[PDB]
RNA sequence: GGCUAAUCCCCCAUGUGGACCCGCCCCUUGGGGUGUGUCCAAAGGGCUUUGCCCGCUUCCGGAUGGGCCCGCGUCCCAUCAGCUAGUUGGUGGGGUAAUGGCCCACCAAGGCGACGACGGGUAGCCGGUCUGAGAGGAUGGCCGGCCACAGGGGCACUGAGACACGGGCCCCACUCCUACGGGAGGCAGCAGUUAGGAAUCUUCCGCAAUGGGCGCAAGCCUGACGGAGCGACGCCGCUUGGAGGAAGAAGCCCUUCGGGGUGUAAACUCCUGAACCCGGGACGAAACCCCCGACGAGGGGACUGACGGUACCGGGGUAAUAGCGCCGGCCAACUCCGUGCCAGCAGCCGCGGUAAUACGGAGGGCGCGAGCGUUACCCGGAUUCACUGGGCGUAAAGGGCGUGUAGGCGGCCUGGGGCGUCCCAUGUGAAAGACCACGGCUCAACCGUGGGGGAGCGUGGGAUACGCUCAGGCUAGACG
C-alpha cells in the first residue's frame, strides 16, 4: 500500500504536470477530493471528476498550464510551479491560527485541515482556526 | 486539582497495591514528531478490587507509602491483556541485550 | 572575650531539665495506666489515666509539648486503655472515657 | 577627543568640499579650490579602482567628518536610528541635524560647526532660556536656540549675527537676527538637506 | 536521518578543543626558563629562531617563542607567556611577553612598540 | 509582622522609594507583597507622591504596620482622614 | 552550704471556650456539628491613679511566613547494562505540626531498567545575560527569587521557628595558652594581613536617610545601609582650542633635479577661555516627640545632614595632555634607505637567498582616540550535527546476506468517543531586565512614571477535518 496517499496525489500531479499530461488519475478518497476542490477553486487545476478506472474509484485531475512560448523550448509555464507536502506520517505538523504561514507573500497558498474542514490559509485565517498544515502550493 | 491519570494494571503481586502503566503523547520539543513516552505508578487498592488487565483512572492522593501517592479512582474498562502483553514482552527482551542469556 | 548571650545557654539548660521532667512523668503514668487497663483493673486504670491526661494537657500549657502533641498522646492513651479494658471490661470510675 | 587637527586634508581625501572652516572655504584659498587631490606623498598619483568596501568606508567617513562627531558617538546615533521607525537613512540625518552644536551652526551664530561647538562648551548658547554647553544636546521641535545675553556683546557674535541680516535659514528652522535667537521648527526632511553624501552606502557599511 | 532517528539519537554537539593548555584558560601563565636554545624552521624557511623551554606555574613545561630583535633570557629567567604558536617551529605554541618580569623589552624599537614592550622614546 | 514601608529604587543621590507591603523580615529591596505607591523625596516632579489609598486601607485593615515615614506619607495622601 | 524578688515554677478554682475517648448527624481520606464522661486558663506593670495605657489567658477567624506531596521540564559517557533487602508492598506501633520504610517489630516477595535503571564525570537552579534573521548555541558575574554550606564529620538542646556562621556537646586536622593535669579558638560579616595567581580596592565617613531588633517613650544597637576612597575594568558626557593666515618659512622626506609632499599645518593676528582664584551655597528632612483636639481624624511648633563648604548659581580668568594599531591579499592605507633564506615577520595564504610596498628605520598614509593593541574565552560567519537547514555510485558515509523482537509507520467507507490537534473565556506567567511613550539630573550613561506584551501550565466551554481509539463494512495492499 501507499504510506501517504495525499503525498502520493500531490506527486502524481507534480509528475503529470512536468510532462504536460492532459489529466492524471489518483485513487479516490473523500479527503483527497476535498483537497482538489481547493485546488480547483484557486485555479491550479481545471477541475476534476470521479471516474472508474477498471473497477475502482479514481479522480481524473485535469491539469492546467500557461501559453506556448518564445525562443528555444516552447513549453509553457506551469500553473502549479510548486506543490509540496508538509505534514507527513512520521512528522505531522499542526499550527495555530496565529501560526498559519503565508505562501509567497500571498501569491501562493497553504492548505490546512481544520475541524471546520479543509481550508486555504485565508479561509482558515478568516474562520479564525488552525489545524494540520497539509501542504503549500504556488 | 488532584491530577487524574488513566492506565493499565500491569502488576498486582503486591498487597493492596497495583502497578498502573500510564502513557502520554506529545510533540518532541525540537523535532515535532508526536512521540509516546510512559510511566508506571503504584496505586492504592485496599480492597484488592482491581485485577491484572484493568484500565483504571488514578488520582493524586495523600502518601500511602514511599513510592506510592495514588489511589485507584475507578475502573474504566475490564480485562484486556493485550496491553499487559506489550509490557511483559518489552521487559522480556531486556534479557536478550546484555552479556547473559535471553530470547529474540 | 564575648557575648553575654551565654545567658540563653544557661536558660536553655534549666528549661531543658524542666521539660525532661514533665515528660518523664507523663510517660511513666501513661504506661502505668495502660498496664492497669491491660490487667483488667478498670477503676484503678482510669483513675491513673486522668492524671496522665491532666499532666499532658498541662505540659501543653507551656512549651513542653504544646500543640497537637498532647492531643496525639491523650488519644493514643485513651484508645489503648479503652481497648485493653474491653477484654474483660466494665469501666467503673468512668473516669475520662465518655459513656 | 573630537579630532582636532588639519581639517582641509579631510576635504582633500574625500575629494569633496566640506566646510570645516566656514569662510575661507568660500575663498580661493580653500585648498580644495587649488589641490583637489588627496593629501600626502601620493595625492597626485593614479587612483586605483576602489573596493566595494573602500567606497562605503570613504562615503561614511565623509558624512561623519562633516559633523565633526566621533566614530563612537556617530555609531550610537546610527544604531538608534536603525532602531526607530522609518527609513533609517533619513532618521539618521535628522538626528545628526538635531545636535545643538550643529543647529547653532545652521542659525549662523557660528561660521563653522567646530566653532559652534566651542560657542556651546563656553556657554554662549541657550535652549529655551536655560543654558546648555553640551554640543551633543538634542534639540527637539519647538525649542528656541538663542545666544547668551551676557554674550550678545561679543566681537565674534557681533560679526556672525550681523552677516545673518539678509541670509536665509533652512525650511526647518527660523532665525531672528535682531533678538539673536531662532527656532527648531521640525526635523529636517531628507530633501531639505543637500549633503554630498549617499546615506544608502552608509547603512550598508554598517551592514557588513 | 529520519525524524524518528533524530528523535532516537539526535544531533551531536561539537566539542572545541584548545590549542593553549595555559591551563585555567588563563590569558597568561608565568614560568621559569629551563633551556634557552635556538631552532631550525621547517622546509620553506631557514634561520636561527630563539625559543625557550619553560616550566610554568601552570605545572607545565613547554617551548615558547622569544619574539623581537634581541633578548636576554638565561637559564633561570622569570618569564610570562601568552597564547600564540609559531607556524614554522612545530612544537612552539606560546610567545614570551617581552616587557614583563625578566624578559626585557626590545631596544631601539620604534614602530610596533607595545607589542615588544618598548616604552615611548624619551626626548622631544 | 507584615508592613507597609519604603523600598529604595532610584540611584545614587537620586532616591526613589516604593511604598510597599512586605513581610517585616525581608530585605528592604527584596520581594514585596504589593506596591501601593511611590515617593520622590526631592519632589523632582509635580507627581512626587502617589498612594492607592483604597489599597493602603485594606492592608492597614489586616495588620500591616507602617513605618513612621510610611505613615507620614500615607497621611499626607489622606489615608487616615475620616472627616 | 545559706538567704531572696518577680511578668520565674507549681497547686486549687472559674469553662467563654478548646483538647481527648465513645455515639449520632451532615460532609466525604483526619472537614463541620452534637451529646455524655474526662482533661486544660491567666501576670502583672505604669500612671496626668480610681479611668486610661502597656501587658497576661483561652478560643474562632484574618494576614504574612513556612512544612510535606504530586504532573511536566532540567548536562556528558552505554568503552557504565543490569540495579535493589528497608530493598517493594502489607498489618501494628514509634515519631512529627503533618503524610510517608521517616524508624521499628512481624508477614508478603516484591520494586527499578534500552522511554537508559545502576555506575562514572561535571555542576548550585531560576528571573535573566551574551550571541543569532530566526531556530538555536553559550552562559548563570552584578541585581531579585529559591536551595545548600559556615575548618572537616556526627548530634541534639532551647524555642513559634534552628539541628542554629559570630549557641551547645563529641570525634578529627590545625593554631595559640599551659605550673603538662588541662584549657582557648574558627572572617564563605565589614575593613585588613598572608598564601596561591596573569589578576581583583580603604584596617575610611555616618546612623542624616531607607530598613531591622528591643523599648510606652526619650532612646540604644545596626561594617544592613546611605556615602566617600582606590583601579580607564565598563558605560555615558567633556577637554587639549575657535576664526583669519603663502600660487605655500625652515627642518624633514621624495625627485624626471623642473618640481612634488608634511599643509593652513606652524609662526604669527584677533576671539573664546578648561583648569585654577574669589562670593554665595542646596535638595535629600518630616516624621518620631511636644501642645491643642479625644493619646483618634484634624491643626500647630521644635529638633535633626555622613555625603560637604561637595553639587549648583554669580564674579574673575590662562591657549593649555595625545596616543595606540595598521599600510602584500583577505583589508582602508606607499615610497627611500638599511638588511641579503641573515636579522627577523607571520591570523590564514605566505615574506626575506642584493635593488623587499610583507623584516628594521624614516617620510607619507589609513583607522580609532583617553585610549589603542594583545592574549584568553563565548556566539557569529559554520546550511561545518543541517528542526528551520546537509548528506552516503566514484568526494567521508549502505550494515556481507537473511529471518525476525521491540519500536516507528499504515488502503477505502460509515458510526461512537474527543487522547493528540484547533478555538473561546479565565487564572497563572513577582520585581528588575527587554520594548514603546512621557518625564528627572544642563545632555547622556543612569533613573522615575505609564503602557504593551509573552511561551508554558491550571480551569470552564466548544469544533471534529487529520492523527489516535472503539465498533461495523469493503477489496484495490498482503496472503491463500
Ligand atoms: K532481569
Ligand atoms: K520553663
Ligand atoms: K486581617
Ligand atoms: K549557691
Ligand atoms: K463535655
Ligand atoms: K490565628
Ligand atoms: K496561611
Ligand atoms: K501553602
Ligand atoms: K506504618
Ligand atoms: K527559523
Ligand atoms: K542552553
Ligand atoms: K543552564
Ligand atoms: K537559559
Ligand atoms: K514598638
Ligand atoms: K496630629
Ligand atoms: K564660573
Ligand atoms: K594653543
Ligand atoms: K642594498
Ligand atoms: K629579490
Ligand atoms: K616597507
Ligand atoms: K616595513
Ligand atoms: K565559532
Ligand atoms: K562497506
Ligand atoms: K559484520
Ligand atoms: K467520529
Ligand atoms: K536577546
Ligand atoms: K490555557
Ligand atoms: Mg494484589
Ligand atoms: Mg506521567
Ligand atoms: Mg538578655
Ligand atoms: Mg521511669
Ligand atoms: Mg529605522
Ligand atoms: Mg553578520
Ligand atoms: Mg624562506
Ligand atoms: Mg592566536
Ligand atoms: Mg609588524
Ligand atoms: Mg543551695
Ligand atoms: Mg467547658
Ligand atoms: Mg465529630
Ligand atoms: Mg462533644
Ligand atoms: Mg469530675
Ligand atoms: Mg484547672
Ligand atoms: Mg494598675
Ligand atoms: Mg501509621
Ligand atoms: Mg500519625
Ligand atoms: Mg528507607
Ligand atoms: Mg529480584
Ligand atoms: Mg561545585
Ligand atoms: Mg545561524
Ligand atoms: Mg537579539
Ligand atoms: Mg535567544
Ligand atoms: Mg542573585
Ligand atoms: Mg576557611
Ligand atoms: Mg521566641
Ligand atoms: Mg521544642
Ligand atoms: Mg546563631
Ligand atoms: Mg541549617
Ligand atoms: Mg565568624
Ligand atoms: Mg604571587
Ligand atoms: Mg539609621
Ligand atoms: Mg530607624
Ligand atoms: Mg614647508
Ligand atoms: Mg587654526
Ligand atoms: Mg566671561
Ligand atoms: Mg581675554
Ligand atoms: Mg531620631
Ligand atoms: Mg503630655
Ligand atoms: Mg490630650
Ligand atoms: Mg500632625
Ligand atoms: Mg587597500
Ligand atoms: Mg647590503
Ligand atoms: Mg643580520
Ligand atoms: Mg631592498
Ligand atoms: Mg606600493
Ligand atoms: Mg603586512
Ligand atoms: Mg550552526
Ligand atoms: Mg534536516
Ligand atoms: Mg556535506
Ligand atoms: Mg568512498
Ligand atoms: Mg549491500
Ligand atoms: Mg524483513
Ligand atoms: Mg512489528
Ligand atoms: Mg489510516
Ligand atoms: Mg499502530
Ligand atoms: Mg481533547
Ligand atoms: Mg493564558
Ligand atoms: Mg516581569
Ligand atoms: Mg530629559
Ligand atoms: Mg516599567
Ligand atoms: Mg499564546
Ligand atoms: Mg480546556
Ligand atoms: Mg462528536
Ligand atoms: Mg473515528
Ligand atoms: Mg475494520
Ligand atoms: Zn576647506
Short mmCIF file of C-alpha atoms (C1' of nucleotides) in Angstrom, two decimals, chain G residues 38-388:
data_model
loop_
_atom_site.label_atom_id
_atom_site.label_comp_id
_atom_site.label_asym_id
_atom_site.label_seq_id
_atom_site.Cartn_x
_atom_site.Cartn_y
_atom_site.Cartn_z
"C1'" U G 38 -12.70 13.28 81.48
"C1'" C G 39 -8.81 16.91 80.88
"C1'" C G 40 -6.90 22.30 80.27
"C1'" A G 41 -6.62 29.04 81.57
"C1'" A G 42 -4.01 33.53 83.25
"C1'" A G 43 0.65 38.43 85.30
"C1'" G G 44 1.40 41.93 86.41
"C1'" G G 45 3.37 46.88 85.49
"C1'" G G 46 2.65 52.46 84.65
"C1'" C G 47 0.33 56.45 85.69
"C1'" U G 48 -1.73 63.17 84.10
"C1'" U G 49 -4.36 56.56 89.70
"C1'" U G 50 -9.76 55.31 90.68
"C1'" G G 51 -10.01 55.78 84.47
"C1'" C G 52 -6.90 55.21 80.85
"C1'" C G 53 -2.10 52.96 78.93
"C1'" C G 54 1.32 48.80 78.35
"C1'" G G 55 0.95 43.61 79.15
"C1'" C G 56 -1.40 38.46 80.53
"C1'" U G 57 -5.21 33.74 79.44
"C1'" U G 58 -8.46 30.56 76.37
"C1'" C G 59 -10.86 30.26 71.75
"C1'" C G 60 -12.61 31.43 66.28
"C1'" G G 61 -11.01 33.99 62.20
"C1'" G G 62 -7.66 37.17 59.11
"C1'" A G 63 -2.80 38.34 57.32
"C1'" U G 64 2.18 37.07 56.49
"C1'" G G 65 5.68 33.20 56.57
"C1'" G G 66 6.65 28.08 56.09
"C1'" G G 67 6.47 22.15 56.02
"C1'" C G 68 5.17 17.94 53.27
"C1'" C G 69 3.17 15.69 48.41
"C1'" C G 70 2.22 15.27 43.10
"C1'" G G 71 2.46 16.18 36.94
"C1'" C G 72 5.90 18.00 33.45
"C1'" G G 73 10.90 20.12 32.45
"C1'" U G 74 16.42 20.14 33.93
"C1'" C G 75 24.33 18.37 31.14
"C1'" C G 76 28.19 14.44 29.34
"C1'" C G 77 29.73 8.96 28.94
"C1'" A G 78 26.44 2.60 27.21
"C1'" U G 79 34.38 1.85 26.27
"C1'" C G 80 28.68 2.22 32.92
"C1'" A G 81 23.72 -2.89 31.48
"C1'" G G 82 21.88 -4.90 34.64
"C1'" C G 83 20.39 -2.49 39.93
"C1'" U G 84 17.94 -3.42 44.72
"C1'" A G 85 16.91 -6.27 51.13
"C1'" G G 86 14.37 -1.21 54.42
"C1'" U G 87 15.01 -3.30 49.17
"C1'" U G 88 8.93 -3.05 47.11
"C1'" G G 89 4.30 -3.57 49.42
"C1'" G G 90 1.03 -5.08 53.79
"C1'" U G 91 -0.70 -5.16 59.42
"C1'" G G 92 0.53 -2.98 64.14
"C1'" G G 93 3.47 0.63 66.54
"C1'" G G 94 7.02 4.69 67.38
"C1'" G G 95 7.98 9.67 65.80
"C1'" U G 96 6.26 14.69 63.92
"C1'" A G 97 2.90 20.39 63.32
"C1'" A G 98 1.78 16.73 59.48
"C1'" U G 99 1.64 12.39 55.21
"C1'" G G 100 5.30 8.65 54.41
"C1'" G G 101 10.10 2.28 55.26
"C1'" C G 102 10.86 8.50 58.16
"C1'" C G 103 12.06 4.47 62.12
"C1'" C G 104 10.79 -0.37 64.45
"C1'" A G 105 8.67 -5.30 65.06
"C1'" C G 106 6.07 -9.14 62.19
"C1'" C G 107 4.07 -11.05 57.30
"C1'" A G 108 4.42 -10.99 51.99
"C1'" A G 109 8.30 -11.14 47.75
"C1'" G G 110 8.40 -7.70 45.74
"C1'" G G 111 10.50 -2.66 43.24
"C1'" C G 112 13.53 -0.37 39.18
"C1'" G G 113 15.74 -0.72 33.97
"C1'" A G 114 17.37 0.44 26.46
"C1'" C G 115 11.14 5.64 27.23
"C1'" G G 116 18.69 4.26 29.70
"C1'" A G 117 17.81 1.68 35.81
"C1'" C G 118 22.85 1.16 38.33
"C1'" G G 119 27.70 3.33 37.72
"C1'" G G 120 31.36 7.26 36.27
"C1'" G G 121 32.22 12.53 35.01
"C1'" U G 122 30.79 17.53 35.62
"C1'" A G 123 27.59 21.21 38.02
"C1'" G G 124 24.12 25.24 42.92
"C1'" C G 125 18.93 26.12 39.74
"C1'" C G 126 15.97 30.38 38.02
"C1'" G G 127 14.32 35.55 36.51
"C1'" G G 128 17.81 36.67 33.14
"C1'" U G 129 22.68 37.56 30.31
"C1'" C G 130 25.70 37.32 25.52
"C1'" U G 131 25.16 35.98 20.59
"C1'" G G 132 21.96 34.82 16.44
"C1'" A G 133 17.36 36.80 10.84
"C1'" G G 134 15.27 33.29 13.47
"C1'" A G 135 15.52 28.31 15.29
"C1'" G G 136 19.28 27.76 18.16
"C1'" G G 137 24.05 28.00 20.69
"C1'" A G 138 26.74 29.53 25.08
"C1'" U G 139 26.13 31.22 29.94
"C1'" G G 140 24.19 31.96 35.37
"C1'" G G 141 29.10 37.74 37.49
"C1'" C G 142 26.43 42.20 39.39
"C1'" C G 143 20.72 42.76 40.93
"C1'" G G 144 15.98 39.82 42.57
"C1'" G G 145 13.93 34.52 43.94
"C1'" C G 146 14.80 29.56 45.73
"C1'" C G 147 18.44 25.92 47.64
"C1'" A G 148 22.97 24.49 50.26
"C1'" C G 149 27.03 25.44 53.44
"C1'" A G 150 29.52 28.35 57.93
"C1'" G G 151 37.53 24.41 59.42
"C1'" G G 152 36.01 18.57 58.25
"C1'" G G 153 32.33 14.67 60.34
"C1'" G G 154 28.24 13.46 63.56
"C1'" C G 155 24.38 15.15 67.40
"C1'" A G 156 20.74 17.03 69.82
"C1'" C G 157 19.02 21.11 73.44
"C1'" U G 158 16.32 25.65 73.76
"C1'" G G 159 12.43 27.82 71.12
"C1'" A G 160 6.54 29.92 67.10
"C1'" G G 161 10.69 28.92 64.33
"C1'" A G 162 17.37 26.09 64.33
"C1'" C G 163 19.62 20.88 64.28
"C1'" A G 164 21.35 27.28 64.75
"C1'" C G 165 28.05 31.42 60.55
"C1'" G G 166 29.61 35.49 65.33
"C1'" G G 167 24.71 28.89 70.70
"C1'" G G 168 25.88 23.97 72.95
"C1'" C G 169 28.09 18.55 73.01
"C1'" C G 170 31.68 14.54 70.90
"C1'" C G 171 35.41 12.81 67.24
"C1'" C G 172 39.29 14.64 63.56
"C1'" A G 173 43.15 18.30 61.37
"C1'" C G 174 45.38 22.78 62.54
"C1'" U G 175 46.92 27.50 65.55
"C1'" C G 176 47.63 29.50 70.42
"C1'" C G 177 47.95 29.20 76.28
"C1'" U G 178 49.87 25.61 79.79
"C1'" A G 179 52.61 25.30 86.83
"C1'" C G 180 51.90 19.09 81.36
"C1'" G G 181 46.71 17.76 84.81
"C1'" G G 182 44.24 20.64 81.25
"C1'" G G 183 42.28 24.72 78.55
"C1'" A G 184 41.19 28.61 74.13
"C1'" G G 185 39.77 29.25 69.01
"C1'" G G 186 37.33 29.22 63.53
"C1'" C G 187 36.35 36.35 58.86
"C1'" A G 188 32.36 31.83 52.99
"C1'" G G 189 30.23 39.58 58.15
"C1'" C G 190 32.97 44.93 57.15
"C1'" A G 191 37.99 46.68 56.53
"C1'" G G 192 42.82 44.42 56.63
"C1'" U G 193 47.09 40.56 56.54
"C1'" U G 194 49.36 36.24 54.26
"C1'" A G 195 49.49 32.29 50.62
"C1'" G G 196 48.25 30.92 45.69
"C1'" G G 197 47.60 33.72 40.93
"C1'" A G 198 48.13 36.83 34.81
"C1'" A G 199 44.52 39.47 38.31
"C1'" U G 200 40.51 41.78 41.93
"C1'" C G 201 40.31 48.13 46.48
"C1'" U G 202 40.09 51.55 52.25
"C1'" U G 203 42.30 48.30 58.73
"C1'" C G 204 37.74 55.35 55.51
"C1'" C G 205 32.88 58.57 56.99
"C1'" G G 206 28.00 58.41 59.05
"C1'" C G 207 23.44 56.41 61.51
"C1'" A G 208 21.46 62.43 58.48
"C1'" A G 209 18.08 58.96 55.07
"C1'" U G 210 15.60 53.79 53.98
"C1'" G G 211 15.23 49.17 56.54
"C1'" G G 212 15.77 45.97 61.14
"C1'" G G 213 15.92 44.42 66.83
"C1'" C G 214 14.44 45.94 71.87
"C1'" G G 215 11.68 49.95 74.45
"C1'" C G 216 5.17 53.29 76.46
"C1'" A G 217 8.72 56.84 75.21
"C1'" A G 218 13.15 59.52 75.38
"C1'" G G 219 16.47 56.35 73.04
"C1'" C G 220 20.06 52.38 72.30
"C1'" C G 221 22.14 48.79 68.90
"C1'" U G 222 22.72 48.10 63.27
"C1'" G G 223 30.55 47.17 58.93
"C1'" A G 224 22.17 46.20 56.76
"C1'" C G 225 22.59 50.61 54.60
"C1'" G G 226 23.49 55.81 52.89
"C1'" G G 227 28.18 57.96 51.40
"C1'" A G 228 33.27 58.87 50.37
"C1'" G G 229 38.30 56.38 48.75
"C1'" C G 230 41.36 53.28 45.17
"C1'" G G 231 41.68 50.86 39.92
"C1'" A G 232 40.14 54.00 32.27
"C1'" C G 233 37.56 47.50 34.49
"C1'" G G 234 32.84 49.06 31.83
"C1'" C G 235 29.22 52.69 30.10
"C1'" C G 236 27.97 57.88 29.12
"C1'" G G 237 29.33 63.00 28.86
"C1'" C G 238 33.63 66.56 28.24
"C1'" U G 239 38.70 68.99 27.12
"C1'" U G 240 43.66 69.55 24.77
"C1'" G G 241 41.14 75.38 21.31
"C1'" G G 242 37.97 78.84 17.53
"C1'" A G 243 38.20 82.28 13.22
"C1'" G G 244 41.98 84.57 9.89
"C1'" G G 245 46.54 83.06 7.92
"C1'" A G 246 51.73 81.75 1.48
"C1'" A G 247 50.12 80.16 -6.05
"C1'" G G 248 52.80 77.88 0.43
"C1'" A G 249 59.08 79.65 6.08
"C1'" A G 250 62.54 76.49 7.96
"C1'" G G 251 63.66 71.35 9.11
"C1'" C G 252 62.49 66.57 7.26
"C1'" C G 253 61.01 63.17 3.03
"C1'" C G 254 60.86 62.03 -2.15
"C1'" U G 255 62.65 63.90 -7.32
"C1'" U G 256 62.27 63.10 -14.11
"C1'" C G 257 66.60 67.84 -10.08
"C1'" G G 258 61.65 71.37 -13.44
"C1'" G G 259 59.48 70.21 -9.01
"C1'" G G 260 56.38 67.25 -5.56
"C1'" G G 261 54.86 66.05 -0.03
"C1'" U G 262 54.21 67.15 5.56
"C1'" G G 263 49.95 71.98 4.90
"C1'" U G 264 46.63 76.32 6.84
"C1'" A G 265 49.65 72.60 9.38
"C1'" A G 266 53.36 76.26 12.05
"C1'" A G 267 54.94 81.11 13.23
"C1'" C G 268 52.03 84.95 13.61
"C1'" U G 269 46.65 88.31 14.28
"C1'" C G 270 42.27 88.55 16.62
"C1'" C G 271 38.41 85.79 19.75
"C1'" U G 272 36.61 82.38 23.50
"C1'" G G 273 38.52 80.75 27.92
"C1'" A G 274 39.09 74.04 30.55
"C1'" A G 275 41.99 74.43 34.55
"C1'" C G 276 42.65 77.40 38.64
"C1'" C G 277 41.23 82.10 42.48
"C1'" C G 278 37.11 84.71 44.97
"C1'" G G 279 31.46 85.21 46.83
"C1'" G G 280 27.02 82.55 47.68
"C1'" G G 281 25.60 77.58 48.87
"C1'" A G 282 21.37 73.20 48.39
"C1'" C G 283 17.51 69.32 47.70
"C1'" G G 284 17.64 64.77 50.09
"C1'" A G 285 14.09 66.32 56.45
"C1'" A G 286 9.49 65.42 58.27
"C1'" A G 287 8.09 62.35 60.93
"C1'" C G 288 9.12 60.03 65.92
"C1'" C G 289 8.33 63.88 70.14
"C1'" C G 290 5.58 68.29 72.40
"C1'" C G 291 0.87 71.46 72.59
"C1'" C G 292 -4.45 71.81 71.07
"C1'" G G 293 -8.01 68.34 69.93
"C1'" A G 294 -10.20 62.55 72.32
"C1'" C G 295 -3.03 59.51 73.29
"C1'" G G 296 -8.01 59.17 67.09
"C1'" A G 297 -9.22 62.44 62.48
"C1'" G G 298 -7.51 67.32 62.12
"C1'" G G 299 -4.35 71.55 63.35
"C1'" G G 300 0.31 73.93 65.40
"C1'" G G 301 5.53 74.10 67.00
"C1'" A G 302 10.63 72.15 67.71
"C1'" C G 303 14.98 69.03 66.74
"C1'" U G 304 17.86 66.53 63.17
"C1'" G G 305 22.91 66.30 57.01
"C1'" A G 306 27.67 61.48 56.85
"C1'" C G 307 27.87 62.99 51.79
"C1'" G G 308 30.23 68.66 52.34
"C1'" G G 309 31.68 74.16 52.08
"C1'" U G 310 30.54 68.83 47.68
"C1'" A G 311 26.52 69.82 43.57
"C1'" C G 312 24.96 74.02 41.61
"C1'" C G 313 24.50 79.79 40.81
"C1'" G G 314 27.49 84.52 40.31
"C1'" G G 315 32.40 87.17 39.60
"C1'" G G 316 37.45 86.88 37.79
"C1'" G G 317 40.45 84.06 34.47
"C1'" U G 318 45.41 81.05 31.44
"C1'" A G 319 45.53 78.79 24.66
"C1'" A G 320 46.69 74.79 27.91
"C1'" U G 321 47.73 66.27 27.59
"C1'" A G 322 47.88 62.68 22.69
"C1'" G G 323 48.35 58.26 21.95
"C1'" C G 324 47.98 53.26 20.02
"C1'" G G 325 47.50 49.73 15.90
"C1'" C G 326 47.94 49.27 10.98
"C1'" C G 327 49.52 50.31 5.31
"C1'" G G 328 51.44 42.14 0.40
"C1'" G G 329 45.88 39.72 -0.26
"C1'" C G 330 41.67 38.99 2.68
"C1'" C G 331 41.59 44.84 4.47
"C1'" A G 332 41.21 51.40 4.34
"C1'" A G 333 46.50 52.99 3.76
"C1'" C G 334 53.30 53.57 -0.42
"C1'" U G 335 57.55 55.38 -1.21
"C1'" C G 336 63.56 55.77 0.07
"C1'" C G 337 67.27 53.72 2.86
"C1'" G G 338 69.04 49.69 5.63
"C1'" U G 339 69.43 44.03 5.70
"C1'" G G 340 70.70 39.68 1.94
"C1'" C G 341 66.91 32.16 3.47
"C1'" C G 342 70.61 36.57 7.76
"C1'" A G 343 68.32 39.61 11.45
"C1'" G G 344 63.50 38.75 11.55
"C1'" C G 345 57.70 38.77 10.32
"C1'" A G 346 53.51 35.55 10.37
"C1'" G G 347 45.74 35.16 11.90
"C1'" C G 348 45.38 32.06 7.07
"C1'" C G 349 47.70 32.26 2.30
"C1'" G G 350 52.98 33.22 2.99
"C1'" C G 351 57.52 37.08 3.22
"C1'" G G 352 63.46 37.50 3.49
"C1'" G G 353 68.92 33.73 -0.60
"C1'" U G 354 71.19 42.14 -3.48
"C1'" A G 355 67.69 46.88 -5.74
"C1'" A G 356 61.51 43.51 -0.24
"C1'" U G 357 55.02 48.40 -0.63
"C1'" A G 358 55.45 41.69 3.74
"C1'" C G 359 61.98 42.10 8.04
"C1'" G G 360 64.11 47.26 10.72
"C1'" G G 361 64.07 52.62 10.40
"C1'" A G 362 62.34 57.03 8.15
"C1'" G G 363 58.90 60.19 5.33
"C1'" G G 364 53.95 59.80 3.94
"C1'" G G 365 49.17 57.44 4.61
"C1'" C G 366 44.62 54.59 6.61
"C1'" G G 367 41.92 53.53 11.39
"C1'" C G 368 40.48 54.81 16.12
"C1'" G G 369 41.24 58.32 20.18
"C1'" A G 370 41.92 58.72 26.75
"C1'" G G 371 42.63 55.34 24.73
"C1'" C G 372 44.71 51.72 21.28
"C1'" G G 373 46.60 46.90 20.70
"C1'" U G 374 47.49 41.72 22.55
"C1'" U G 375 46.17 37.05 24.98
"C1'" A G 376 42.32 34.05 26.71
"C1'" C G 377 37.13 32.53 26.44
"C1'" C G 378 31.51 32.51 24.46
"C1'" C G 379 28.06 33.25 19.98
"C1'" G G 380 28.56 34.57 14.81
"C1'" G G 381 30.08 33.71 9.76
"C1'" A G 382 29.63 27.45 10.16
"C1'" U G 383 23.12 25.04 5.92
"C1'" U G 384 30.55 22.60 9.15
"C1'" C G 385 25.38 17.85 13.84
"C1'" A G 386 21.60 20.72 8.78
"C1'" C G 387 14.19 21.08 13.48
"C1'" U G 388 14.20 25.76 10.48
#
